[PDB]
Amino acid sequence: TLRAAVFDLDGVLALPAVFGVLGRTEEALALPRGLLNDAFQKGGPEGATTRLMKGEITLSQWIPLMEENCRKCSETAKVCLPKNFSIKEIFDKAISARKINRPMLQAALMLRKKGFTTAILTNTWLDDRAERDGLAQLMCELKMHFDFLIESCQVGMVKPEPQIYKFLLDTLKASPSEVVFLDDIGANLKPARDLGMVTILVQDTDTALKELEKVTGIQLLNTPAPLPTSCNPSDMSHGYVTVKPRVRLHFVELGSGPAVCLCHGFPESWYSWRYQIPALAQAGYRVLAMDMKGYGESSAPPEIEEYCMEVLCKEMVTFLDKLGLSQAVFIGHDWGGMLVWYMALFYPERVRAVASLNTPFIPANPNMSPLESIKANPVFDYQLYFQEPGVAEAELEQNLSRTFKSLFRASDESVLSMHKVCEAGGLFVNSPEEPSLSRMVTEEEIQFYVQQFKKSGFRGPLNWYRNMERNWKWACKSLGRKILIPALMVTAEKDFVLVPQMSQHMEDWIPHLKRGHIEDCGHWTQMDKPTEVNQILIKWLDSDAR
Amino acid sequence: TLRAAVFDLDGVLALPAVFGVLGRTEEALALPRGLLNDAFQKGGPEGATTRLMKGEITLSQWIPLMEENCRKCSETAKVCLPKNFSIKEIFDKAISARKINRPMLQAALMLRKKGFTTAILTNTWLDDRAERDGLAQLMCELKMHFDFLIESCQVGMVKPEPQIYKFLLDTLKASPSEVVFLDDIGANLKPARDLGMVTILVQDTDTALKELEKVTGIQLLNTPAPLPTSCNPSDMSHGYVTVKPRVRLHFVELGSGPAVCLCHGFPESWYSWRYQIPALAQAGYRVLAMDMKGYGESSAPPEIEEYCMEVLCKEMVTFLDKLGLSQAVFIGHDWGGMLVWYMALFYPERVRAVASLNTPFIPANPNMSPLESIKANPVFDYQLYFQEPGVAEAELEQNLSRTFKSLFRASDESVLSMHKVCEAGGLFVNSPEEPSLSRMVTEEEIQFYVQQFKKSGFRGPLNWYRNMERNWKWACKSLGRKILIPALMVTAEKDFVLVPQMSQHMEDWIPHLKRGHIEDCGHWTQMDKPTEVNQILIKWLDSDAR
Ligand SMILES: Cn1ccc(CNCCc2ccccc2)n1
Ligand SMILES: Cn1ccc(CNCCc2ccccc2)n1
Ligand SMILES: [Mg+2]
């Protein structure tokens, strides 16, 4: 029966409410109780405040009217306003204090996940204050989570006028008995209840969610910790930069503030950062999530040396040149982790800070050929398997769904040891035809990877592994240097290919290295433990990159 | 004969040089003359400084070696270094003081314009200092103007070693007698002169350019003021955002810092901002230069109401939402100018500041139909001509080269009065078949517009003029408001359609409006007077938007 849920902003999705500051200010200043609310509501349907809420005048034009109202109210109550009494001041403070009410948003998120149409209906104003950006950010953050945002000042109607609820119903494409509406003002509920909507009077959040839970039949309270917000590819800004005649790099871009360039691993996509991209942008950064060369909508030339680290890195520098960025923070995972260490060693002027998930920095051994070093570690056997052009391509391209479903698995779910892969004849030779779906991924997310890899297959990706000698020779150039810019290494306890202990000497080359470590986290770090990754990167960004 | 020109960075393209700070620091501190240079050059080919210049060690690892050198030099000279003597300090200061030598860059620019291959060859270092971003910005700014940048620390060779000049020649694809090489160190010139290159020893800039001028046969000194840097479309980052199911907006993006959204006019392109985009990015902004709806690589649905101001503006808000931008500075010209005023009135929380070139803000007259108002001004006759769907499309699409060549003309070059256009039967009825090229545009630039307009023709563009009534009704909603965010109006003296005096009442609605005014500037403001536009916008951005 219920199909739609409508939330107010002030006092419902955001707290403390502003009217609360009229009450609080009265108390704090020992004014006659209600004096500020009387001034706020002066004139009723024809007073300044209604004209504000309807979009007739802006907030800045309203401020001196509320002033006059406060003066007139105090005169009739035979009191004085204190010296320095400031409506602008009171409101700047109330509007900055007001924060997203997290459990209410999470309820709305969950209900939207169960198929509810969700909306914010609010009496609000056109905000032209010097400090308006704070409200713009709050509204941005809330609104992406709802089907509709209906603002009194954009539609020219205000709660409790009956016409705005008719407009709501019409916007929802729903009948009134299909709708629950939450508000902290009883007068604002009545016209909804008159049309037969279920209504909830919100005082404390938990009681409102209890009523909301009872009436929808969906669990909303005491629910597990939800995953961070993910990205919908077709809602992203997609960017494309030609770094040389046959090579264009694609990236997805979100956020403003310091530039942060995410470099994914093998065989992955910009989409592997889907959980980090909204969280980092929300944290105050300009995120650029790449398709690395070889992948997705980036170019994939066939030649092996197009994918040596020297060339890949020079291209990343040109990418910054064409975008007009003097620096970015470089955050990499897996092969992308290897790449950002080399950006830090060869182009430190272009790297604001450097972080790697899983991939350690290990200086080239100038006394041992890289192939030998690889042969010494049985877990890198699969890398020998990758050398011969065409062999791994045929196995990995043969059935893309089976490829990504076999690779992208949590640490307690694996279906492929990296064990004597050459000798076995392939990576998947003892894995199922139709693996089950990992807890980490939905069938929809697997199909995005499959679709990306239909454009160029696995040749460009595999070529990243085919420059061992060439990368070793270039790396040997850097053996006298240290990495002295801000740097973060994040180890994953149960990554069995890139194990934590392989990073144990990094402080010899990077003396001020900072660390995070994620327990119970396998190789696909960003989608395995997205919440922990988010917290570790944002904390390190805010202290070291900013 | 000469075909290539090679410039050093320190002491040639950038001034003051750093060695100059060794000399200056000695003097300032009353140290033994040359002591700092002796320390800098200690050990020669095997000393710390050569290892730096070759990329063996980074700047930060070099600093304490130079320290030791200074100590050892002072001991043997039986003097003391002052308390607080700091190599880091000296170098941070010298590297920040060092600025692009403008007349040398302009010479290089001009020579490159006459077909020279140009290069920077420099002994420089890997810069990992906290303050490295300053050098990264200088290098970014210089390097886009040259064919090649060859850095000692990336190539592992240093002037004056002979191998670096061979590497240069090989990079240039030129023989030595085709090359002039400029350097401020005579020792660095010798190996070039040994190979038979023309060399110029640079002390003061003017004398070096005199020699450079004599030897190339090209005028380089006393030359007129060159145009600002323009954009090459295929070197730009191209971005695409879907704002609703059939509408994606394309934009070009350059720079970091506060977001600045450029909105072009009829019938134009993101490319109409080609002279502003590098200058604004260089001035510290994140430029987003749109194809507005209807144009270029943005979507162009056929329906008239898709192009009313309400819909266009809501889409610009969604564009900011999907990019994760809480605000941008909105700068518009012509129809794009009209649009940014309406963003300021309906979405001030999303607009950091607003500026318009040419287009005044004039409140809707609620007592007169917009068509009548249009009929009252003979210069807007062409707007009636535009009403009837299909008529203006056929004339404007018939020959695109002739269309843009006829429209894009300086004030002393016009070929079309806007005079009784209906009665004449078209916009071009008394203009030539093959107009001459305006001084404002090259044949190449005309052909870019022609190519853009082959994708969707003129239907979407003309539709901007076909919502007079619908725009009037929405504008009437805003008649109680004022624009109280930072705002700039730029009038063009000789724009005969959007004349300066039409803006004369704007302070009634925008009391703190700032102004610029460009004399001898016709309707195509950005390409008519790009230099003046640049200066006026950057000065207003730095004071009001930042
Ligand atoms: C030198 N290097 C850079 C990155 C790596 C590890 N790549 C693991 C990818 C993979 C994961 C599972 C199965 C096969 C391969 N090694
Ligand atoms: C209401 N409004 C917004 C913008 C304008 C002026 N458009 C001029 C374009 C043009 C220039 C030359 C020839 C024909 C048309 N009027
Ligand atoms: Mg409320």
Ligand SMILES: [Mg+2]
């Ligand atoms: Mg020099």
